[PDB]
Write a protein that binds this ligand. Structure first.
Ligand code: VIT
Length: 121
């Protein structure tokens, strides 16, 4: 759930998921339209696609557990859904971290109306 994902984001980026990544660009929020503004926004686009491929689950709501070994996130053994949701979240948190170098404040509080157009996964 948002709880676990937010924890990973803080651990990997040093930033609080909300509000640092909850209104970023076109995809880091609830929206999902248009061309991703940058690398960070693409991380969210990919995250949505990952979630979108878990139709048999409830990604944004389902709770799950994970741990850190050797300084890296390790999705622990749980239900199929729990494990997959965790991996989608892990990939995104790491993606945010790898791209902090281009994280731009100007994309925060980004209005959805500026994002239109269907972008296939
Ligand atoms: C679909 C989709 C959703 C729904 C989404 C985001 C993105 C990119 C998406 O593509 C990012 C932001 C937000 C608005 C996100 C995160 C939740 C809170 C900040 C949770 C954090 C929890 C903390 C650390 C737990 C700390 C635990 C320790 C103190 C033990 O949710």
């Amino acid at each position: 759930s948002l709880l676990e994902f937010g924890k990973m984001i803080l651990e990997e980026t040093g930033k609080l998921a909300i509000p640092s990544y909850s209104s970023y660009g076109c995809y880091c929020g609830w929206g999902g339209k248009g061309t991703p503004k940058d690398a960070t926004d693409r991380c969210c686009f990919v995250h949505d696609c990952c979630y979108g491929n878990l139709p048999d689950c409830n990604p944004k709501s389902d709770r799950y557990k994970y741990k850190r070994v050797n300084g890296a996130i390790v999705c622990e053994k749980g239900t199929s859904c729990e494990n997959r949701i965790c991996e989608c979240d892990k990939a995104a948190a790491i993606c945010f971290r790898q791209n902090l170098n281009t994280y731009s404040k100007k994309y925060m509080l980004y209005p959805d109306f500026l994002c239109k157009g269907e972008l296939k996964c």
